[PDB]
């Protein structure tokens, strides 16, 4: 019924002093679990990789340690000009500041009623009792080019499409450089994960908009999750805080550095590399003072590729730790309802 069609949070958040009930977490699930302390500082050395020196042995070691410890790292000297990072996030902000009716010309609710992934709106509301996240998003298929539907790409500002195309071409370079270093450190060959991901590899842009929340202790901006694909390249406008990462059951603030990107692994990579590096669970907490904008570039595996532990990682004392599954089937499985506290990737573990 009506709960299947959410009104965007940017609208519902305007002027409120309490979060509407459908956003309120149970006390034990809250950031801070009922307190006002949401996460602990990340212990040093914080995971930071200089992409321009990634071929050097000491930089490769930093990448390996970051992926082993956290499953993510900040990247410096990554080749994306500050002006382009600023302009693509300005295009996003320009879009989200438009009136609701203008943005819903790109709505991800078909006919105003039926959820699909692509477009402006919210993640799927699967049940009336689902607690909703305090965010809206514009999600667009970027690659492969023949799978795009430009009808969902904002026409205003009119440079939106050009800026996203240019930015995505630069994050693809980051993807490649990271994947080649991961192939090298695992002794699989630099092209190993490039070839696994394949010609038809997916790239999806997700523009997240988190409105201010009067009670950041009661809600999530985006709930705890891991990304499903191979690797994600994340840009946070003006380095506004909110992103946190889980390790051994503890939540840590993901630090910021000016003019950096964040790289994290996804579940498909966790399978392909036999769990040597894992896909990190992460979340965003809101704040009371200001909106927060991010752009996630999700890089996936072509659908027909069987995800499996790389043969070069296996041996008499190195058992496979994950079952094989077609990438397209893994992504379908992620869409299915899951029991409270459970993770889909765990169902593939041996
Ligand atoms: O906004 C962020 O920093 C994280 C967004 C995220 O995790 C996602 O879109 O999957
Ligand atoms: Co994510």
Automatic annotation (TrEMBL):
Domain (Fe2OG dioxygenase) ranges: 199-301
Keywords: Dioxygenase, Iron, Metal-binding, Oxidoreductase
Protein residues bound to 2-oxoglutarate: 208, 210, 292, 294
Signal peptide location: none
Entry GO MF terms: dioxygenase activity; metal ion binding
Keyword Hydrolase attached: no
Record InterPro entries: DIOX_N, IPNS-like_FE2OG_OXY, IPNS-like_sf, Oxoglu/Fe-dep_dioxygenase_dom, Plant_2OG-oxidoreductases
Similarity remark: Belongs to the iron/ascorbate-dependent oxidoreductase family.
Protein name listed in UniProt: 2-oxoglutarate (2OG) and Fe(II)-dependent oxygenase superfamily protein
């Amino acid at each position: 019924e009506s709960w299947r069609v959410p009104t965007p949070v940017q609208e519902l958040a305007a002027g409120v002093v309490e979060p509407p009930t459908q956003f309120v977490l149970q006390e034990q699930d809250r950031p801070g679990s009922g307190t006002l302390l949401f996460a602990t500082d990340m212990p040093e050395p914080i995971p930071v990789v200089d992409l321009s020196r990634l071929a050097a042995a000491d930089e490769a070691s930093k990448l390996r340690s970051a992926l082993e410890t956290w499953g993510l790292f900040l990247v410096t000297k990554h080749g994306i000009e500050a002006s382009l990072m600023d302009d693509v996030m300005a295009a996003s902000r320009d879009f989200f500041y438009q009136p609701l009716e203008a943005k819903q010309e790109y709505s991800n609710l078909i006919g105003g009623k039926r959820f699909q992934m692509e477009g402006y709106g919210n993640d799927m509301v699967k049940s009336k009792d689902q607690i909703l996240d305090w965010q809206d998003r514009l999600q667009l298929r970027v690659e492969p080019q023949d799978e795009r539907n430009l009808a969902y790409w904002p026409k205003h500002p009119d440079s939106f499409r050009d800026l996203l195309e240019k930015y995505a071409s630069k994050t693809k370079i980051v993807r490649n450089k990271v994947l080649r270093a991961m192939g090298k450190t695992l002794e699989l060959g630099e092209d190993y994960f490039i070839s696994q991901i394949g010609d038809r590899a997916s790239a999806i842009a997700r523009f997240n908009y988190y409105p201010p929340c009067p009670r950041p202790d009661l809600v999530f901006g985006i709930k705890p999750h891991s990304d499903g694909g191979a690797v994600t390249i994340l840009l946070v406008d003006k380095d506004v805080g909110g992103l946190q990462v889980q390790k051994d059951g503890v939540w840590y603030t993901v630090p910021s550095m000016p003019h950096t990107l964040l790289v994290n692994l996804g579940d498909s990579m966790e399978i392909m590399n036999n769990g040597i590096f894992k896909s990190p669970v992460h979340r965003v907490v809101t704040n009371a003072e200001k909106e927060r904008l991010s752009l996630a570039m999700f890089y996936g595996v072509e659908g027909q590729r069987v995800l499996e532990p790389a043969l070069g990682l296996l041996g008499e004392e190195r058992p496979a730790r994950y079952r094989k599954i077609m990438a397209s089937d893994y992504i379908i499985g992620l869409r299915q309802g899951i029991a409270e506290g459970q993770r889909f990737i765990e169902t593939l573990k041996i």
